[PDB]
Amino acid sequence: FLKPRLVDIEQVSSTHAKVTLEPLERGFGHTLGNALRRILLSSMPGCAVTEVEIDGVLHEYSTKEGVQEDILEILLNLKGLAVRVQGKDEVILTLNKSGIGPVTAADITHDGDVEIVKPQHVICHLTDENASISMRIKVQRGRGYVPASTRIRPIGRLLVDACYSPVERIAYNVEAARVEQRTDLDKLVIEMETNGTIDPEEAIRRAATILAEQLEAFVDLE
Amino acid sequence: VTEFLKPRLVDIEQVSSTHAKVTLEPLERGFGHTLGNALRRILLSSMPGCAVTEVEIDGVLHEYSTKEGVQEDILEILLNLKGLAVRVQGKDEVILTLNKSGIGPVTAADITHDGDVEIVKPQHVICHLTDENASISMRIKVQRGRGYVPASTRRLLVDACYSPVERIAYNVEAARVEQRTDLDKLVIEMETNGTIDPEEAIRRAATILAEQLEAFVDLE
Amino acid sequence: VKSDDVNGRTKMYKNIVDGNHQMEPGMPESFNVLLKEIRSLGINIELED
Amino acid sequence: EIKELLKLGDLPTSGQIRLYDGRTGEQFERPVTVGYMYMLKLNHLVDDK
Amino acid sequence: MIKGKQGRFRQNLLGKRVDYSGRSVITVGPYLRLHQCGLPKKMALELFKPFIYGKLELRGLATTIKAAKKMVEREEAVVWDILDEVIREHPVLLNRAPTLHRLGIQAFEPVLIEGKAIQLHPLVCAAYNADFDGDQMAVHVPLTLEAQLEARALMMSTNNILSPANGEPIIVPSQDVVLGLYYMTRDCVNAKGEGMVLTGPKEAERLYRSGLASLHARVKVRITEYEKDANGELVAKTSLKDTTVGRAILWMIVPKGLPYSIVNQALGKKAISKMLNTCYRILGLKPTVIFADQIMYTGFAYAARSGASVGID
Amino acid sequence: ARVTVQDAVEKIGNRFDLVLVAARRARQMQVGGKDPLVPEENDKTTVIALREIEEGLINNQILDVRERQEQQEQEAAEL
Amino acid sequence: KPLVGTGMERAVAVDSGVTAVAKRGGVVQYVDASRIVIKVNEDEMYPGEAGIDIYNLTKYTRSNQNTCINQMPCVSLGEPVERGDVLADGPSTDLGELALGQNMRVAFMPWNGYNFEDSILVSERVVQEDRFTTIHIQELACVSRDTKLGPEEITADIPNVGEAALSKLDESGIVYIGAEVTGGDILVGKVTPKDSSLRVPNGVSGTVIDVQVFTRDGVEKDKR
RNA sequence: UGGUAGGAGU
C-alpha cells in the first residue's frame, strides 16, 4: 500500500484553497475524501464572537440614537465577524468610533495576538457626527455550533449566537495520477472554503489527527 | 476544546465462530457514520486474502457442458470452488490438484494437502459423483490479491473473492449521555469466510486505515 | 380516578408515590350533579339497593 | 423561456443535478431535481402546541 | 343544562376530561420499532411526575414530597436517571382527534427524545389516518397495574395487525418504502454486472455495495429456500434462480418459511401487502412484526439511495 | 422489553382472563413481599408476570392453590 | 424578497400601512434607526411656512397575533427620493416588496424516510444562520385590585420568598427593563393583605422590552 | 373567573 503524501497547498484566494494528495491506491481516494470532508465540516476549532456589550443600550431589541442600523442587526453583523487569536482562547475587543461614516471592523482596537482577516467587514453606520458608539467584544475558542440559549449576569451584556466553524464548503475529486509506470494510482484534491481564520494544510492535519485518534477506539495501538 | 469522546469496545458479541456483532460506546455526532462507512469500504475493497481465480479440467473444455456421472452442473462446480476459502503462507501463487472416483460427495478435504495451503472447512462440498466408475480430475490455481475481482475484468475463469469478509452492515442509532443529549452509537455486523475471525478483520482494517494517515499526523 | 372521584383522586395519588398501583372506583361527581339536577325538577332519582 | 434562462447560466436545461450522498459519499442515481423554492414558516408553532 | 351536547349527559358524563394527559404535534420517526413511539423529555417528565416522586422517596434522595417536588422542578441530573427507570416498560396510549376505528387509540412503548414533537412509526400512521402536516395527537398514561397489563395485552400496536372490519392487514408499506422496494425489485435490459453467477444473497449485496454490479442487473443466484412440507419442520431447498441483484438482496430479510416466488416479481404495493399477509398466515405474528420492521427499513434505505425525483421533463 | 403476547395467550386462550391473572400475580409481587420465580432483569412487574405466564409455571389454578397454602400457613401460626 | 414571484408584491406592500411612503419627494437630510427626515424639493414645497416633514418609524411593537412590528430605514443619507417611493420597510417587506418568507435550495428526493408523507428535512445550516428565527412579543398585565381587608399594593418586599427573586426586581417592585426573565420569575410585587405576585408563565423566556404603568387619578405614585 | 360569539388547524 502506497502512503499518501501532501504535495500542493495551492491557494487561488485568501479564502479559497485546494489541497492535493498525489499517491493513493484504488478505492482509498473516495474513502479518504469523504471521511476528511465529514470530519472537516463537522468539527474544527474556531474563534467566533460570543459576547457584546454596548454602553448606551440595555437589551438587543432597542435602537441607539444616531446609528443607522438596529441593535439586533448590529449583533447579526457582529456574528459573522471572522477573527483568529493565535495566543489565547479568550480575548476582549474594544471598538470606538465617532463621526459620520460606516463603522468597519478595521476600527476595532487590536492586540498582537488578535488579527482581522477582512477589515472591509462593516458593523454599523453612523449617520450623525455628534453620535458615538462603543463596544466590548468578547471572543472565545470553540468548535461546532453553540446556541445562545444553552450557555449554563448584568443587564447590559448582550448574548449572540456562537458558530465556531472556519470551513463552510468542502469539495473533493479523485483523479488518475501517473507515478512511475504502475497504474490505478489516484490523486485526491480537496477544495476548501474558509473564512480565513484557519490555514488549509493545518486544517487537513488536524482533521486527519482527529480521524486517527478516533480509529484507536476499536483497534489496538498501531 | 480538542478533546473528543472515545469509545472502548462496549460490546463484541459473537453470534457464531464466523459471525459477530460489534457495538461502540457513545461517539460524537456524525462520527458513527463516517467510521462505519470507512470500515465498510476498507473491508469490502482493500483486504489481503487468497482465493481461487481459474480452474482447468481435462474432462470439460467449454464453459457450458456436461460431465458424465456428475449431478452438479459445470456452473455449480465453479460456484463451489469459488466459495472455498484457503489461506497460503508465504508463496503467492500455488496450484492445487484433486482426483477422485466413486459415489460420494467430493469434500474439500479430498483435495491434496499440497503442503503449506490450509482449508478452513474440510466439509465443503465441491461436486457429487453419481457413478462409481465415474471420475473427476480437476486443477485449481490460487493467488493472493486485494478485494473482489470479477471474471469479466479477467481454461475456466471464476471471479475471485480475495477479501475474507462476506457481509458488512453498520447501523447507527442515538445514544444518551448526561452532558450531551445527541450522540451516536455504532453497531457493526460481521460475516467472514472463517479464515480470519471477524475481530481480526476489523483490527486489520482499522490498522490499514490508520497506516494510510501516518504522513498527515506529523508532530502530533 | 383521573376525572371526578375526588376521594379516588387523592387515594390514587397517595398510592402511586408509595409504590402501589391499586384503584378505588368510587362514584364520579358528575353523576351526583346530574342526580341533583334531575331531583330539582320534581323527579325522584334514587339509587335503590 | 425557463430552459433558455438556465442555458444563459451554466446550468443543465433539464433542471436536475446529480447529487452525492452526504454520509455514504456515493452519488445518487436518477438525477434529482434541485432548485430554489420560496418557503414560509407558518404561525402554527410547536412550543405553543 | 341536562339535554343537548352542552348538557351533562354528553359533555360530562360520557366525556370526562382526564388527568395524566398531554398533546403535541406529531412527526415521523423511521428509527422506531413497531411497538415504540417517540415522547419528548419534558412531556414524559410532566406526565410521570407522581412516579418520579415515588422513586425519589424510595431511593432516598428526597426525604419529603416538597423536597422531591423542588428537585423535579430544578430538573437536576439525578431526575433523568430516575425517569429512565420509570418509563422503561410503561405503555402510553396515543389517539388522534377523530377516533373512528377501534384502532384510533393504540398503546406504544415510549422512548425519551429531545424536542417538542411525538415521533410516530411510519407504518402505524395508516390506521391513525395521520398525515404529518400539523396533525396533533393526545397521549394518556395508564396508571393502575391492571390498566398497564390491559394496554400491553390488547392495545399495543403489535397486536393490531388485522382490522376488525375485515381480515385484510391494517399495516402496509405505503409511500416511500413501497417505492424503494419496487425500485430494488426491477430488471434492466443491460446493466453493470449482467450475466454474473453468484454464490448467494450476501455476494449480491457485496457486489452492489462495491459498485461492480447494478441493482437491476439480471444474474443467477443460488438461493436457500425453506418450505415447511412437514408439520412443524422445515426442509431446505437450494437451486439456481434467474433473478436480479435487487431481488437477491431483498431475500435476506425474508423469513425462513416463505417461498422465493414472492420476491422474484416487481413488488408493487399489492404484492407487498400479499407478502405480509402470507407471512402472517404461515409463520404467525412475531415473524410478521420483525418482517414488517425489516421491510420498512430496507424500503426507506433503498428509496433514499435511488434518488427518485420529479421534474418538468 | 417484551413485544408480543401471543405466546402467553397460548397458555390462557381467552386473552381476557390473561389480563386478570397477570394483574393478580403482578399485584402479588409489587405490593406483598413475594419475590418473582422467573429470574428478573431490571424489568417491570408487568413483563415479569407475563414471562412467568409464558413459561407455564403460573395459572389461575396455580395461584389459587398457592393462596390456599398461604391460608393454611396463616391459620397454622395462629395455633 | 422572493426570487420568483407574480410581480404585484410591490403593489400590495405599498398599498398597506406597514411601509412608510414619502408623501413629498426630496433629499434625505437625516436618517436613523428611529426616524427619517426628508428635505422637500422647492417645487413641491408649499410657499407659506415651508418646512421639512419628519417620518417617525414604529419600532418593535406587539401585534394582534403577538408578533413584532418594526420599520427599517431602507434609504441612506443624502439619497434623493420622490413622491410615492417607500422610505421604511415594514414587517415582512424588503425594499417595498412583500417578502413573506425565505428562498432556499430544495431537492426533491426521499431521504431515509425522514420526509415520509409531508415531513420536511432541514439542514442545520438553516438554523445556524438564523434565517427562520421569529420575534414574539407578549403582554403581561397586573392590576392593583381594591380587595377587602385593605387594598392590594405593588411593593418590593414579598413575604416568604428568596432574595434572588427580589434581585431582578428594582426597589419599587417592578422588573428592570431588559432583564432576562424566565418562567416563574416575579415581575411585580402585588402583595395582598392576609402574596399573589404576577410572574412569567412557564415555558416563556424572553427579555422585557418595556413596562407601562397606568395609575388612578388621586393616589400616590411609586418610585418606579 | 365563567357563558357567548369571532377566526383558524386537523
Ligand SMILES: [Mg+2]
Ligand atoms: Mg394531517
